[PDB]
Design a binder for this molecule. Structure first.
Ligand code: MG
Ligand code: MG
Lengths: 130, 196, 173, 104, 118, 51, 162
RNA sequence: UCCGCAUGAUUUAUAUGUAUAAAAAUAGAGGUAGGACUUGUUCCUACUCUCCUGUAUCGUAGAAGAUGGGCGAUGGUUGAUGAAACGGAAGUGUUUUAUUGACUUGUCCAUGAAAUUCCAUUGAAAUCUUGUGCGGAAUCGAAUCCAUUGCAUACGACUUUAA
RNA sequence: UCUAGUGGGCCAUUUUUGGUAAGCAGAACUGGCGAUGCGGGAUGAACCGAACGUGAGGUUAAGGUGCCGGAAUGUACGCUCA
């Protein structure tokens, strides 16, 4: 289903830009592609395909479109919201939140999970009562 | 980060030597290892070439007394054990103790079929061999060099898979009722803000 | 890591000719020392001059004017095989002339076992027109509707859980 | 009463191909898989806990303590020095890495 | 007499004295034309050499920092009147039991430590 | 005299014993306070980009 | 023979910033190991902690700055606490060099209120009474201080945020 | 020899939560009640859940975890028995039922832990043999030598017989 | 100034002559072994690295880092099926 093409949106996995959204704007060869992102601290760059994973978002982008055109068409479409409203991005966001919990927060999660367990076991048994 | 006492490895689909080197290192670190389904191991290269390698091994016998000679074990788990032994300093006490902490078997006999079985990604054929590269299965190599139990293992494995499917079906149903009683809980909102 | 340098040098002036001519080369070398050495290597086979009787008057690293623009680079080389000498032409897609040159050296090492010492780069040019591209594998990359699946890598598991010896499940593509 | 240390394995002495240096032990720490993550455990107290047959002060538990000195290689192994050099029969035996000299 | 370090506590036994009862343990320099010990091949026994000499400050000192002075009579013990913190009295083996008592008493009067009391 | 060598690059007191000027030494002077012209030239750039 | 006079002046310790008074800390060693306590003040080498006695049973005591983990939990207001009395002399054992006889039968007297003097159970209650209002304000704090810290399977301290 | 009233010691303990059983493919259905019907090489139904492997999930608060309560469901954990059912590849394990103990932190208070007054440690419980008071009687063997055989044999060994 | 041992050498690089060739014989140059341990080349007098008092710490050479075995089942681009 997923293919390398101009306009295909990618998620960078290796390197200093790990976990950032980007769009293929030009295909240099079968190993590398020039990518871009409206984000200010993300620079237009050539990246190897092994450093990114393909998302399912494919943008209507012309080959070789510059930074200004990419940013405009990215906002014209819903790409930032389109990626974020997905099970993939939601699972990564949950992982990012989970990485930053301090000891107090881990204690809070444990307490809440204890409460959920009691309700879950009760609700299971009552369903079985019918 | 696997420091558990005993690990059970599903040998199906693993490359012989790569799995052997990982297991041998684990044994030397003090891990007890069980390797199950040794008949489903793979060796890269086409069948004829790997068959010839065993036949050349089978020629090596003590000229003046073959009962002293190299003992050529034919069963798949013995072929794996030989690979592991070759990667251990087995003539030392440390190597012998490492080797004794390995248990390699054909099929999945009853102690282990109710236990969790893991894989070793560094040794998986689908990850390591280029598609279209010919490879052989150890059970087939073993059966043509004198191993006698391909059929009984296969029949017992089909019976085990039927029971495991029944066990899995029962566990699927139980987890569904728990998940329904979980997503309907009011405490899900405060768990969301923590990433749970 | 190769870099491109322009090197300008000349015969040291003598009484016979007090205005020797200035000769320039573009050279791909890992540093300035190698660049100057390569300059004298190529100048010795054309002009009656050595390092002892010549001098370098300038050396400048040349960066790529458009490192963000994918290009086609045609490289003419002369190389020594085990049996003879040949000239050959190769084409590479890259964003820098340095990147193409590094691709060429790796390519000659892989396909002909040609070492660095056995290769002379005659010329590196950015090919502008589609039809001037002589290799089909290169001009198929100039198609606007170019599409292909991700190449077969050995999957990817972060950096840390890829260091885990044991996995609970078999991978899924 | 629960665990306040990280699990570790005593792998080998520091060595070349044929020469061993038992004054330094190579220790693999569970969950520590790079030389950068090994920096956290540098200086941490590490212990070898074992049972003998003769009680001392009513106890048959014996401990040999040490300290993590430096990372070893690329994969999170560390070098450790113990007050008494660890016996070679403990290769592959468990160790405990504490948090005791804490900077967090 | 402070921080006494021994560079080595093993004694340097003669090569092959472990294999032949006729070959005494006392050190002999191997002079064989093929000797692996003389050539210092790896894994062979060490040979005594001057690098093993101990710190000049602590050389000859017993663990307590004193040096064991042999005494054969009371007047030998009296030699250690001023040198009470540097020398200990070692009573000779061939001194009689009567004279030994008089020596132990004289040392105790002078505060001279006796290595072999009893 | 002199039982232990001390590296002046680490021991600041020793670096003061040698080199009395270190106290007044001023590194990181700003000299680009002006308009900063560009010195490349037409001939230089056409030679630079040949071939 | 007299030694030289060393050139080694005694300068104050600089504790890390994470150990500010009011920080919740996890104890790593000793009989109260694993306990979350509350930092009252910074002594020279140690932290005067309480981790209120009524909440988890840890009394006013010192702890070396190396043998704690400073949690980033919300700070507990210790502003209104008289911490200028907890000196080194306050925590110091009575000098037992010399006229002593180490044996058994002294555990019976050295343990209960037969050993704990007055004004030590009194100021313990005083600092506690000034800390419970701040602890009660933050939800889960009292349960958090009562619970013991432990490492579970999969925990990697070099990666965990504390 | 079995239980027993209970004395010592060992190890599960290479412990320190050392908890987690589908199967199969990888240019694929990975399958997740997988949904959706008629149980079929068909759904356009559920289509972005897939790809983050487990950084997951399950457990995890209380003198090594004490002593008393107000609320809230009507559940959860463990232990002893019941009658069992299913387990043969090495089943020695998995599941359920009736009586009866113990706990429950689902939520909220009260009492208590200190001087072990700055780390140098292990916490209890059961599980199997052994010293012993024995009530309760004992349900109970064999092999070998010396003999014998000749289907055997240098000697042992072997096949027989036997009180 | 007096005196010892020695007056069978051998190996390698490079230049050679004789020989069909040789783990052959004879010469040239330097480095070696003999009299040289140590790290490396699985092994090995001479090859690579390096020449050694007893030790602590650090860093290297030559050579390595799937397991035996200390050290990336590292990264990049290709080639190759026996
Ligand atoms: Mg000695
Ligand atoms: Mg290793």
């Amino acid at each position: 289903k997923r293919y390398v093409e101009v306009g295909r949106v990618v998620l960078v996995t290796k390197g200093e830009y790990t976990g950032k959204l980007a769009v293929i704007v030009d295909i240099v060869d079968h190993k590398r592609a020039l990518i871009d992102s409206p984000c200010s601290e993300f620079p237009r760059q050539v990246i190897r395909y092994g450093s990114v994973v393909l998302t399912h978002i494919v943008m209507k982008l012309p080959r070789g479109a510059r930074s200004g055109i990419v940013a405009k068409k990215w906002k014209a479409q819903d790409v930032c919201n389109k990626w974020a409203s997905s099970a993939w991005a939601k699972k990564l966001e949950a992982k990012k939140v989970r990485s930053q919990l301090n000891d107090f927060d881990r204690f809070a999660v444990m307490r809440l999970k204890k409460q959920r367990r009691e309700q879950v076991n009760v609700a299971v048994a009552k369903a079985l009562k019918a | 980060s696997e420091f558990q006492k005993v690990v059970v490895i599903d040998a199906k689909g693993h490359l012989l030597g790569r799995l052997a080197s990982v297991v041998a290192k684990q044994l030397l670190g003090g891990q007890k290892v069980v390797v199950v389904r040794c008949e489903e191991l793979n060796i890269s290269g086409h069948f004829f070439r790997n068959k010839l390698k065993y036949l050349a091994y089978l020629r090596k016998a003590c000229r003046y007394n073959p009962s002293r000679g190299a003992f050529h074990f034919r069963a798949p788990s013995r072929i794996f054990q030989k690979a592991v032994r070759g990667m251990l300093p087995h003539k030392t006490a440390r190597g012998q103790a490492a080797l004794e902490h390995l248990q390699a078997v054909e099929g999945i006999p009853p102690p282990f079929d109710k236990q969790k079985r893991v894989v070793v990604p560094a040794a998986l054929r689908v990850l390591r061999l280029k598609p279209g590269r010919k490879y052989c299965t150890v059970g087939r190599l073993s059966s043509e060099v004198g191993w006698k139990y391909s059929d009984i293992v296969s029949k017992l494995e089909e019976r085990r898979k039927v029971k495991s499917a029944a066990f899995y079906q029962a566990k699927l149903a139980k987890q569904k009722k728990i998940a329904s009683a979980k997503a309907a809980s009011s405490v899900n909102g405060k768990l969301a803000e923590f990433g749970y | 890591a190769l870099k491109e340098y322009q090197v300008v040098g000349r015969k040291v002036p003598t009484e016979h000719e007090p205005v020797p001519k200035l000769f320039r080369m573009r050279l791909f070398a890992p540093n300035e020392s190698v660049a100057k050495s390569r300059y004298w290597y190529f100048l010795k086979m054309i002009n009656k001059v050595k390092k002892a009787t010549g001098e370098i008057v300038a050396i400048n690293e040349i960066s790529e004017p458009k490192p963000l623009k994918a290009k086609v680079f045609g490289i003419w080389i002369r190389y020594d095989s085990r049996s003879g000498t040949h000239n050959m032409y190769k084409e590479f897609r890259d964003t820098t002339r340095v990147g193409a040159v590094e691709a060429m050296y790796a390519d000659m090492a892989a396909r002909h076992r040609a070492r660095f010492r056995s290769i002379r780069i005659l010329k590196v040019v950015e090919v502008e027109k589609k039809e001037d591209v002589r290799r089909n594998y290169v001009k198929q990359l100039l198609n606007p509707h170019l599409k292909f699946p991700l190449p077969h890598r050995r999957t990817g598991v972060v950096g840390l859980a890829g260091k885990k010896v044991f996995a609970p499940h078999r991978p899924s593509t | 009463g629960h665990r306040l240390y990280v699990k570790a394995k005593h792998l080998s002495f520091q060595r070349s191909k044929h020469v061993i240096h038992p004054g330094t032990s190579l220790v693999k720490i569970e969950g520590c898989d790079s030389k950068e993550e090994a920096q956290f455990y540098l200086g941490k107290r590490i212990c070898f806990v074992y049972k003998s047959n003769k009680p001392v002060r009513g106890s048959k538990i014996r401990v040999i303590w040490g300290t993590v000195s430096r990372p070893h290689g690329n994969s999170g192994v560390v070098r450790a020095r113990f007050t008494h050099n660890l016996p070679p029969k403990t290769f592959g035996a468990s160790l405990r890495v504490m948090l005791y000299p804490s900077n967090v | 007499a402070v921080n006494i370090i021994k560079k080595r506590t093993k004694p340097f036994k003669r090569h092959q004295s472990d294999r032949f009862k006729r070959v005494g343990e006392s050190w002999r320099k191997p002079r064989g034309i093929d000797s692996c010990v003389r050539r210092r091949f790896r894994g062979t026994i060490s040979m005594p050499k001057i690098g093993y000499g101990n710190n000049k400050k602590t050389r000859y000192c017993m663990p307590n920092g004193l040096k064991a002075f042999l005494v054969r009579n009371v007047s030998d013990v009296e030699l250690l009147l001023m040198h009470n913190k540097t020398y200990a009295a070692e009573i000779a083996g061939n001194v009689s039991a009567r004279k030994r008592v008089e020596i132990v008493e004289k040392a105790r009067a002078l505060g001279v430590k006796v290595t072999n009391a009893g | 005299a002199h039982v232990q060598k001390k590296n002046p690059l680490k021991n600041k007191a020793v670096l003061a014993r040698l080199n009395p000027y270190a106290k007044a030494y001023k590194a990181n002077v700003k000299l680009n306070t002006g308009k900063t012209p560009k010195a490349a030239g037409e001939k230089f750039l056409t030679v630079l980009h040949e071939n | 023979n007299v030694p030289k006079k060393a050139r080694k002046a005694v300068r104050p310790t600089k504790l890390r910033a994470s150990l500010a008074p009011g920080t919740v800390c996890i104890l790593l060693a000793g009989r109260f190991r694993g306990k979350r306590v509350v930092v009252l003040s910074q002594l020279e080498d140690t932290l005067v902690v309480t981790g209120p006695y009524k909440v988890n049973g840890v009394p006013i005591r010192r702890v070396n700055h190396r043998y704690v983990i400073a949690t980033s939990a919300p700070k507990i207001d210790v502003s209104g606490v008289s911490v200028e009395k907890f000196t080194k002399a306050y925590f110091a054992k009575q000098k037992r060099s010399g006229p002593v006889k180490k044996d058994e039968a002294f555990f019976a007297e050295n343990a209960p209120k037969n050993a704990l003097p007055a004004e030590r159970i009194a100021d313990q209650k005083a600092v506690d009474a000034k800390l419970l209002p701040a602890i009660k304000a933050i939800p889960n704090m009292k349960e958090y201080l009562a619970a013991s810290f432990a490492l579970s399977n999969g925990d990697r301290p070099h990666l965990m945020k504390f």
